[PDB]
TrEMBL record, chain C:
Gene transcribed to yield this protein: env
Chain positions covered by the region annotation Immunosuppression: 47-65
Domain of life where this protein originates: Viruses
Protein name as annotated: Transmembrane protein gp41
Disulfide pattern: C71-C77
Subcellular location: Virion membrane; Host cell membrane; Host endosome membrane
Coiled coil: 106-137
UniProt lineage: Viruses, Riboviria, Pararnavirae, Artverviricota, Revtraviricetes
Shown residues in whole-protein numbering: 567 to 661 of 860
Residues annotated as glycosylated: N84, N91, N110
Membrane topology value: Single-pass type I membrane protein
TrEMBL record, chain F:
Human immunodeficiency virus 1 envelope glycoprotein Gp120 domain residues: 104-445
SUBUNIT field: The mature envelope protein (Env) consists of a homotrimer of non-covalently associated gp120-gp41 heterodimers. The resulting complex protrudes from the virus surface as a spike. There seems to be as few as 10 spikes on the average virion. Interacts with host CD4, CCR5 and CXCR4. Gp120 also interacts with the C-type lectins CD209/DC-SIGN and CLEC4M/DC-SIGNR (collectively referred to as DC-SIGN(R)). Gp120 and gp41 interact with GalCer.
Keyword terms, alphabetized: Apoptosis, Clathrin-mediated endocytosis of virus by host, Cleavage on pair of basic residues, Coiled coil, Disulfide bond, Fusion of virus membrane with host endosomal membrane, Fusion of virus membrane with host membrane, Glycoprotein, Host cell membrane, Host endosome, Host membrane, Host-virus interaction, Lipoprotein, Membrane, Palmitate, Signal, Transmembrane, Transmembrane helix, Viral attachment to host cell, Viral envelope protein, Viral immunoevasion, Viral penetration into host cytoplasm, Virion, Virus endocytosis by host, Virus entry into host cell
Domain of life: Viruses
GO biological process: clathrin-dependent endocytosis of virus by host cell; fusion of virus membrane with host endosome membrane; virion attachment to host cell
Origin organism lineage: Viruses, Riboviria, Pararnavirae, Artverviricota, Revtraviricetes
Molecular function, one GO term: structural molecule activity
Subcellular location: Host cell membrane; Host endosome membrane; Virion membrane
Entry protein name: Envelope glycoprotein gp160
Cellular compartments per GO CC: host cell endosome membrane; host cell plasma membrane; viral envelope; virion membrane
Membrane topology, as annotated: Peripheral membrane protein; Single-pass type I membrane protein
Glycosylation sites per record: 54, 112, 148, 185, 192, 227, 240, 298, 305, 311, 341, 345, 386, 399, 402
Disulfide bonds: C23-C43, C88-C156, C95-C147, C100-C109, C169-C198, C179-C190, C247-C281, C327-C383, C334-C356
Glycoprotein is among the record's keywords: yes
Length: 240, 211, 137, 226, 213, 446
């Protein structure tokens, strides 16, 4: 009944180092092992190691025994049975095949034959290893298009282009518009640039009472784009 | 008026207590005053001795103990006969304008000395001034007792005699003066006059005559 | 099974199973707490003696519950009352190897009085009926 | 420092006493100075003192009849006492005053006090309160055996307090005795001063007695001869 | 990975399916516990099975585990649309970390068909102003896990600048995909129309845009 | 798969509650001093070995401001004061008119005694200025300040006012949770928890403003408060390094025993032998300035980086503005100007000496009623105490807000002195009954 929030996605050149954090809440951080597991396209899911916040004893897989350093802070108590903590994993000598998604995971039981078993997982941290630099994205409006003339529904959105750092988030009306949102995965161009599209389906009659603003974020390039989608469509089926 | 007297044997240690007892932490001066001279500061700060004052004198320190201010004279001499004032200062009495009542120190047991007697007849100028006074000077006698008698020839003169009371001099010996005032016809009336002095020692006399 | 003794309340932070075996530690000090000699009561023993009686009144209150539950002489005893899933929906390994007795009491706190009613009625009040019938003949 | 007093020798009742004190060997500006007297049959009475700031403080027993002043241009201390009576007849000493501090605690709490101690004194000066006038002394020679003879001067009938007697200044200092005075029933005073002289020194040496009677206007020398 | 699972397995709606998990005796299960995880791509996994048969808290009784001396098995009964995903097994002890398997993708047969939704977007005027042109063919709501996309310039195929993504699963257990056609402004203006053709084994849909309007 | 409930007796489960604790202290014989009220005749024999048990993995919430041990200790010190004043002599006949003169606040006062022991007795004793007030105001007559408010009773001469260590214990079935966190805030969850049967040796040092002879906070000093933004609540501070304060009554006073009648004996202040020196307290300015600098470092931790001024007390009566305390038997009232006269911004020794007056009649804990006459202490007085804490108070309404902040000393309540040493202890009731389901069933009856 607790939440584990990991640090944001990062981009580090090969040969450099990176330290990922994992802040915990909703449970006694001292009572459960913190596991670190990664997933790459070349080797699939691979368990890296775990560390005990209570005793400090760490167990690393031999593949990560010489390049991973795990540390934990002291639990900041909240109530008698809950607290807040943080666990850190510092990985060095990064290579291209290390690009992937990393996860911190809470143990299963305090005692028994399977105490460290990863039970509660974080949302994941995306790590990109490449010699290329950070490129800011470009946002274009996707004009409204008809979805059902008899149903009176339309679809509008925003198109994102030319960005190298894969982590990109899109919201609508500062998070006030969540229904009908559909975000599509990104495309991998031959140049090494990633681009995606996002679209939302709304009634065609909603033109004079609702404002539609797409908010594009990009933590690596540290660029925010607030684009106003022009509701005037050019589709003949929607013009009717 | 009565002040205070003290008697001490020659050569021993005299202790003069202060007439006042301090109510608080004290500052006491001890002064020595001889007749006809300037007073001397013997002790200041209850325990400090000015330069030139012999170490035979000493005061009592204010160590917060219950001790009265005391002046100690070790090996007293006849030259220590004087009056000793205890000027007392303390924190509870205020500005002490009073020097207090000193205690006269009398040093006893010094050798008895024989008195010297000198008898002068009336001057020729005094006779031609229609007066006449016979002067009998007694000096250099250490014991205290005295008595001077005058005799016109063989009969004792009873009036016209004015004798000083004896007092010690700069040699610590006593001295007295006796004056018998006569008229020029009384002086030339008798064949002789005589000053006979009495001193717990023995009969002593001298004699003059008109010539 | 644990043979290490930690003292009174030493197994509060441990799991319920690791603490269910050391119940003799919290049972000896629960009752014994006596100021043996040297006491004068002057706005003290009135408060002190009542605190000592309130301890044995709640102690005998707990033994009264264990008396009507058929567990007067045992710390560990099993019953006939089935476990209602509405009380807690956790399995066996989730309770005795993950939670503590402190946080467990907070979860079942809402139904403690309900279970106490069924514990003195569903079994002991009804098992004594068949106990009279088994030794009847 | 050296102190020497000078006075009138005689004051009449209901008049103003005045004495002066010359200082030597030390500057008058950097010290406290005070006056003390002693009357016959009484003890030393502290009159008052002047500070280096030329501020004065007096014994209340004097009833504001006293006033003390400084004169740095002549390095002299001065004292006046108005409206005198016979009780004011005394020998008046001038003295230096040093201020000490006896502290028994915290200075800010007033747990201290001051005290004065006189360290240098003067021989004093005789001052009499009497209605009559100063009478000069008529002095006579007492003409002069164990190798020595007696040689005297009779100082007869002088009115107030002391008389200074010297003998050839410094030459005759070895064996001179000036006797204490006698009080005649007339109120007049008389003393005698004698010297012991070798009989061989008679007829060849000379001896005069210098009789100073400062209260009266007087000055006499007397050559004594057999 | 030395822990091998069945590469693929299929079951019908409302039926049961079994996934295998075996390997050498160095990783075998006689002396090691076996756990099972449901791991949807791009999302955090969820533990369903641990210590062989014992299931995780809150797991439905439809899931069961069984471990022989040469292999372990995971049985999923009463298959649902959400059960159609990737599954992994792991061998572990108490002091040694997890060793993941090769993975198994489960397909649920007997599901209803879901018509595809195609939408084609032309390049924006701001993009033509920037001297590029990209046609965006968005496609959603798919019954099968596969599509085939073709582009046409004036009813004739295109082969330069075509980039198509892999199919992705929607939150409603449907599928989705997208395709992009990069073009120069000359090719965009020199043709009467462009077309995106989405071909499925049951029906082929065609959407057409025109640079004239 | 069949789960049956199972009873467990002795489960580590506790709940907050308030109960009635008891005294604990070492058994010092003290044959020369007949049973001082804090050592008592016989309160307990303290356990030879103090026993504490760390409760690992246990977090618990503490609140020193809603604690019941403070309200208990406050009611116990008040009741112990009344039980110690009943058998002692009451000063009902002394209120006879007093003819007073100065010895300077200290004054001599003649009076005529009404005895029963031959009809009357003239006597005059040394009384301070605070104890008396004139009626004719022509200095002809005086009276005790208390003779128009309430009764007065002289404290017994055998009992001593020295605070000794007192341990507060919980009865059977109860436990005391001790927080051991170093940087422990006043209220909140404490990670390190250990249980004890009795608290540490707490000395009941009744003090105003600065806290004396207390416990020092470990590592960094601590700023504790119920509300820091709301001024109306006091501010308790606990230093790490204790400053030394040396107070003295240099007056070599003397005691004069006066018989009222059958058995009744009054102890009057005789004439003082020696000099009159008012009471004072040296506090080292260097280690006070160092301590003052460590306090402002942490006060600013809740008031931006730099905004603070130190002034003196300006509200209440004389018994609240002054540092009131006990030493040697006499109660001192010290002026605290020089300690709280500073200004800090932007983040030689001269031992500071405070003037202290003396009062022999007192009304502590805001007690309006039965009043105590402190008998005079013979001989000079000198005590050295370790000032360990302070009690401050904001001024409040400020237009500049962060522009300047001002902290004045105050002592609105005595319970703050118990809160400065009871912040770490808490009372709980052990509930040993726990029911949990297992796969075990009792032997079937059928
Ligand atoms: C809080 O702190 C403050 C300071 O921070 C403390 O204050 C102290 O309080 C005590 C007790 O009241 C004081 O003691 C008294 O000191 C008097 C001063 O004399 C000697 O001390 C000073 C240092 O304070 C030295 O400088 C002196 O020597 C120098 O000065 C003289 C004068 O210029 C020179 O001539 C010398 O050559 C030096 O250059 C002195 O040594 C002192 O008079 C006083 O009275 C007597 O007490 C004792 C015990 O009997 C004697 O030893 C002492 O000598 C005094 O005795 C009398 O006789 C001597 C000669 O023998 C004469 O000097 C006097 O007539 C004297 O009356 C007492 O000792 C202390 O001075 C003071 N310190 C400071 C720095 O202010 C507080 O105590 C403290 N609070 C507490 C609770 O402790
Ligand atoms: C206070 O709070 C924390 C909870 O956060 C508890 O810490 C847990 O303590 C339990 C009990 O000791 C631990 O569970 C144990 O796991 C061990 C696995 O660790 C192995 O590998 C590590 C490397 O990280 C080594 O340090 C360790 O020595 C082991 O080699 C098991 O060894 C334990 O028992 C296992 O083996 C025995 C036989 O040997 C079997 O009977 C068991 O069934 C089991 O297979 C045990 O399972 C848990 O890992 C700890 N977690 C953390 C995060 O530290 C404290 O216990 C708790 N209370 C107290 C009093 O401290
Ligand atoms: C604690 O110590 C302080 C520090 O000394 C002490 O404060 C002092 O109080 C007295 C009493 O008022 C002050 O004396 C004043 O002096 C000024 C001139 O310097 C006078 O003008 C004052 O008279 C006026 O004010 C009086 C009070 O308002 C009126 O009654 C009067 O009619 C005049 O209007 C007064 O005499 C002294 O100045 C201060 N100290 C300092 C350094 O200023 C204080 O009393 C001690 N006790 C406490 C605070 O309980
Ligand atoms: C109560 O009234 C009586 C009335 O006599 C007071 O007694 C008198 O006290 C004084 C001193 O204050 C005595 O005077 C002197 O005492 C000293 C002490 O040493 C002594 O040395 C003197 O010779 C002189 O006696 C006086 O004698 C004494 N009365 C009698 C009859 O002896 C008493 O002090 C008063 N008490 C109070 C507290 O007011
Ligand atoms: C301020 O607080 C500090 C912190 O304790 C005090 O330091 C200690 O002061 C005492 C007294 O000066 C020192 O004792 C002395 O020790 C030396 C030898 O070291 C000895 O020769 C002396 O006779 C005396 O006993 C002590 O060592 C010292 N401690 C440290 C660690 O420095 C300081 O005194 C306080 N000062 C003031 C003005 O408050
Ligand atoms: C305080 O006062 C007492 C009372 O006088 C002092 O004690 C006596 O002091 C004297 C001084 O010589 C001794 O002879 C006595 O033996 C002391 N005791 C008695 C019972 O008389 C004491 O010294 C004073 N001292 C201080 C520091 O206050
Ligand atoms: C015991 O059950 C009651 C009833 O549901 C709980 O009280 C409600 O708790 C919810 C949140 O859990 C609140 O939103 C409601 O306002 C509460 N009251 C009502 C009337 O619904 C209570 O929290 C439960 N206690 C425990 C310890 O589980
Ligand atoms: C209060 O006490 C004083 C002192 O005994 C009484 O009057 C004093 O009488 C003495 C007698 O020598 C005088 O020296 C004092 O000056 C007097 N006092 C004053 C203030 O002048 C006085 O009569 C007493 N009064 C009462 C009402 O008891
Ligand atoms: O934080 C305030 C102050 O507290 C005391 C500490 N000293 C020690 C020895 O712990 C100071 O360093 C600190 O500044
Ligand atoms: C007691 O009464 C008498 C009678 O008037 C009075 O003179 C005296 O001052 C009073 N006080 C004392 C202490 O004697
Ligand atoms: C008692 O005296 C005090 C002294 O100020 C006064 O305030 C009070 O009003 C008096 N008592 C009554 C009942 O008024
Ligand atoms: C926590 O507890 C341990 C042992 O009980 C003790 O050594 C340590 O000092 C404590 N630390 C804190 C911050 O309470
Ligand atoms: C410490 O406690 C006070 C009072 O509850 C609170 O206002 C303050 O925020 C706490 N400290 C911190 C760092 O939050
Ligand atoms: C202090 O009081 C203010 C005003 O009522 C309030 O807003 C604040 O929350 C309080 N803070 C604490 C710690 O009590
Ligand atoms: C407080 O400190 C911070 C960090 O050094 C600084 O940014 C800020 O400007 C400071 N504020 C003031 C008022 O000094
Ligand atoms: C504060 O102390 C200084 C000396 O450090 C002093 O001059 C000033 O008057 C004091 N101020 C107050 C209000 O006491
Ligand atoms: C800080 O205080 C000092 C000391 O008086 C003063 O000179 C300075 O101007 C003050 N600075 C500020 C910014 O208040
Ligand atoms: C008081 O301070 C002194 C001096 O540092 C120290 O020796 C003593 O242990 C301290 N006592 C207390 C109770 O703080
Ligand atoms: C507070 O400040 C404002 C201007 O900032 C001023 O008008 C007002 O009078 C001030 N109030 C007080 C009580 O000083
Ligand atoms: C309080 O903050 C204001 C900003 O509004 C600043 O100007 C002022 O300097 C601050 N006060 C300080 C630092 O004392
Ligand atoms: C300090 O005292 C002065 C004078 O009493 C007063 O005007 C000022 O407001 C005070 N400052 C504080 C912060 O208390």
């Amino acid at each position: 009944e607790g939440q584990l929030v990991q640090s944001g996605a990062e981009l580090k050149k090969p040969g450099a180092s990176v330290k990922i954090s994992c802040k915990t809440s909703g449970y006694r951080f001292n009572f459960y092992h913190i596991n670190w597991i990664r997933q790459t396209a070349g080797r699939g899911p691979e368990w890296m190691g775990w560390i005990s916040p209570y005793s400090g004893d760490k167990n690393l897989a031999p593949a990560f025994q010489d390049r991973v350093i795990m540390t934990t802070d002291t639990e900041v108590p909240v109530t008698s049975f809950t607290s807040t903590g943080a666990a850190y994993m510092e990985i060095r000598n990064l290579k291209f095949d290390d690009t992937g998604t990393y996860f911190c995971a809470k143990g299963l039981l305090r005692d028994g034959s399977s105490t460290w078993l990863p039970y509660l997982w974080g949302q994941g941290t995306l790590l990109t290893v490449s010699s290329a630099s950070t490129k800011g994205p470009s946002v274009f409006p996707l004009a409204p298009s008809s979805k059902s003339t008899s149903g009176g529904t339309a679809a509008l959105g925003c198109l994102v282009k030319d960005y190298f750092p894969e982590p990109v988030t899109v919201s609508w009306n500062s998070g006030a518009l969540t229904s009908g949102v559909h975000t599509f995965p990104a495309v991998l161009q031959s140049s090494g640039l990633y681009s995606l599209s996002s679209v939302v389906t709304v009634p065609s009659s909603s033109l004079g009472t609702q404002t539609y603003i797409c908010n594009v974020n990009h933590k690596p390039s540290n660029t925010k784009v607030d684009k106003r989608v022009e509701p005037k469509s050019c589709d003949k089926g929607l013009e009717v | 008026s009565y002040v205070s007297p003290l008697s001490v044997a020659l050569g021993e240690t005299a202790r003069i207590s202060c007439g006042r007892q301090a109510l608080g932490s004290r500052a006491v001066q001890w002064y020595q005053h001889k007749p006809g001279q300037a007073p001397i500061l013997l002790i200041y700060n209850n325990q400090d001795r000015p330069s030139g004052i012999p170490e035979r004198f000493s005061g009592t320190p204010d160590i917060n103990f219950g001790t009265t201010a005391t002046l100690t004279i070790s090996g007293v001499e006849v030259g220590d006969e004087a009056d000793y004032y205890c000027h007392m200062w303390d924190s509870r009495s205020g500005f002490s304008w009073s020097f207090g009542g000193a205690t006269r120190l009398t040093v006893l047991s010094q050798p008895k000395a024989a008195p010297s007697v000198t008898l002068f007849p009336p001057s020729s100028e005094e006779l031609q001034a229609n007066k006449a006074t016979l002067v009998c000077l007694i000096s250099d006698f250490y014991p205290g007792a005295v008595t001077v008698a005058w005799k016109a020839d063989s009969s004792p003169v009873k009036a016209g005699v004015e004798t000083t009371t004896p007092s010690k001099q700069s040699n610590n010996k006593y001295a007295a003066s006796s004056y018998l005032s006569l008229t020029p016809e009384q002086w030339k009336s008798h064949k002789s006059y005589s000053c006979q002095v009495t001193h717990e020692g023995s009969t002593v006399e001298k004699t003059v005559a008109p010539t | 099974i644990g043979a290490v003794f930690l003292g009174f309340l030493g197994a509060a932070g441990s799991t319920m199973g690791a603490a269910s075996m050391t119940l003799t530690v919290q049972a000896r000090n629960l009752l014994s707490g006596n100021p043996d000699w040297l006491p004068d009561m002057t706005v003290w023993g009135i408060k002190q003696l009542q605190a000592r009686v309130l301890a044995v009144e709640r102690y005998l209150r707990d033994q009264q519950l264990l008396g009507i539950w058929g567990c007067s002489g045992k710390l560990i005893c099993c019953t006939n009352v089935p476990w209602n899933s509405s009380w807690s929906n956790r399995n066996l390994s989730e309770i005795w190897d993950n939670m503590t007795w402190l946080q467990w009491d907070k979860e079942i706190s809402n139904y403690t009085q309900i279970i106490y009613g069924l514990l003195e009625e569903s079994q002991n009040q009804q098992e004594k009926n068949e106990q009279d019938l088994l030794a009847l003949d | 420092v050296q102190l020497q007093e000078s006075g009138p020798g005689l004051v009449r009742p209901s008049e103003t006493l005045s004495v002066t004190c010359i200082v030597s060997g030390g500057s008058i500006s950097n010290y406290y100075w005070t006056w003390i007297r002693q009357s016959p049959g009484k003890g030393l009475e502290w009159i008052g003192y002047i500070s280096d700031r030329e501020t004065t403080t007096y014994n209340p027993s004097l009833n504001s009849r006293a006033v003390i002043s400084r004169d740095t241009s002549k390095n002299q201390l001065s004292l006046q006492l108005r409206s005198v009576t016979t009780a004011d007849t005394a020998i008046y000493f001038c003295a230096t005053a040093r201020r000490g501090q006896r502290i028994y605690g915290v200075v800010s709490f007033g747990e201290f006090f001051y005290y004065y101690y006189m360290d240098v004194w003067g021989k004093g000066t005789a001052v009499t309160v009497s209605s009559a006038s100063t009478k000069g002394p008529s002095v006579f020679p007492l003409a002069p055996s164990g190798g020595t003879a007696a040689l005297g001067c009779l100082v007869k009938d002088y009115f107030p307090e002391p008389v200074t007697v010297s003998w050839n200044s410094g030459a005759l200092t070895s064996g001179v005795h000036t006797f204490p005075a006698v009080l005649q029933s007339s109120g007049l005073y008389s003393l005698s001063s004698v010297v012991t002289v070798p009989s061989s020194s008679l007829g060849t040496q000379t001896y005069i007695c210098n009789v100073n009677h400062k209260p009266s206007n007087t000055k006499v020398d007397k050559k004594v001869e057999p | 990975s030395v822990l091998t699972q069945s590469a693929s397995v299929s079951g019908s709606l409302g039926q049961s399916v079994t996934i295998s998990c075996t390997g050498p005796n160095s990783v075998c299960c006689s002396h090691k516990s076996i756990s099972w995880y449901q791991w949807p791509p791009g999302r955090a996994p969820t533990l369903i099975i641990y210590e062989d048969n014992e299931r995780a808290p809150g797991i439905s009784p439809r899931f069961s585990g069984y471990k022989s001396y040469w292999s372990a098995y995971l049985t999923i009964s009463d298959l649902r649309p959400e059960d159609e995903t990737t599954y992994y097994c792991c061998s572990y002890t108490h002091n040694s970390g997890c060793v993941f398997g090769t993975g198994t993708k489960v397909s649920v047969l007997g599901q209803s068909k879901a018509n595809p939704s195609v939408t084609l977007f032309p390049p924006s005027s701001e993009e033509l102003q920037a001297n590029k042109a990209t046609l965006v063919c968005l496609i959603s709501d798919f019954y099968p896990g596969a599509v085939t996309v073709a582009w046409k310039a004036d009813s004739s195929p295109v082969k330069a600048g075509v980039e198509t993504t892999t199919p992705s699963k929607q939150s409603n257990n449907k599928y989705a995909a997208s395709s992009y056609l990069s073009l120069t402004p000359e090719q965009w203006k020199s043709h009467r129309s462009y077309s995106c053709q989405v071909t499925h084994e049951g029906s082929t849909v065609e959407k057409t845009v025109a640079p004239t309007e | 798969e069949k789960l049956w409930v199972t009873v467990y007796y002795g489960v580590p489960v506790w709940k907050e509650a308030t109960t009635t604790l008891f005294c604990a202290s070492d058994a010092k014989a003290y044959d020369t001093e007949v049973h001082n009220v804090w050592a008592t005749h016989a309160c307990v024999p303290t356990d030879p070995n103090p026993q504490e048990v760390l409760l690992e993995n246990v977090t618990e919430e503490f609140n020193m401001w809603k604690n019941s041990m403070v309200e208990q200790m406050h009611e116990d010190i008040i009741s112990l004061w009344d039980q110690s004043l009943k058998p002692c002599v009451k000063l009902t006949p002394f209120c006879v008119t007093l003819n007073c003169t100065n010895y300077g606040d200290i004054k001599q006062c003649s009076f005529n005694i009404t005895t029963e022991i031959s009809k009357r007795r003239n006597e005059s004793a040394l009384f301070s200025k605070l104890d008396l007030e004139p009626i004719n105001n022509s200095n002809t007559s005086y009276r005790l300040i208390k003779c128009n408010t309430s009764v007065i009773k002289q404290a017994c001469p055998k009992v001593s006012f020295e605070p000794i260590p007192i341990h507060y214990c919980a009865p059977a079935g109860f436990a005391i949770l001790k927080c051991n966190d170093k940087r422990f805030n006043g209220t909140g969850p404490c990670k390190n928890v250990s249980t004890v049967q009795c608290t540490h040796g707490i000395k009941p040092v009744v003090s105003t403003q600065l806290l004396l002879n207390g416990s020092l906070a470990e590592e960094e000093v601590v700023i504790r408060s119920e509300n820091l933004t709301n001024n109306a609540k006091n501010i308790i501070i606990q230093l790490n390094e204790s400053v030394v304060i040396t107070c003295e009554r240099p007056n070599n006073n003397t005691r004069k025993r006066v018989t009222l009648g059958p058995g009744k004996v009054l102890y009057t202040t005789g004439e003082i032998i020696g000099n009159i020196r008012k009471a004072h307290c040296n506090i080292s300015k260097t280690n006070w300035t160092r301590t003052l600098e460590r306090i402002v470092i942490k006060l600013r931790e809740q008031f931006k980086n730099k905004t603070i001024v130190f002034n003196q007390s300006s509200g209440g009566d004389l018994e609240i503005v002054m540092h009131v305390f006990n030493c040697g038997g006499e109660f001192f009232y010290c002026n605290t100007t020089q300690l709280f006269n500073s200004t800090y911004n932007s983040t030689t020794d001269s031992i500071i000496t405070l003037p202290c007056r003396i009062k022999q009649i007192i009304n502590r804990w805001q007690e309006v009623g039965k009043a105590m006459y402190a008998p005079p202490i013979a001989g000079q007085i000198r005590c050295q105490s370790n000032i360990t804490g302070l009690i401050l108070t904001r001024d409040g309404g400020g237009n500049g807000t962060n522009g300047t902040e001002v902290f004045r000393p105050a002592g609105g309540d005595m319970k703050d002195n118990w809160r400065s040493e009871l912040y770490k202890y808490k009372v709980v009731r052990i509930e040993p009954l726990g029911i949990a389901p297992t796969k075990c069933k009792r032997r079937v009856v059928g």
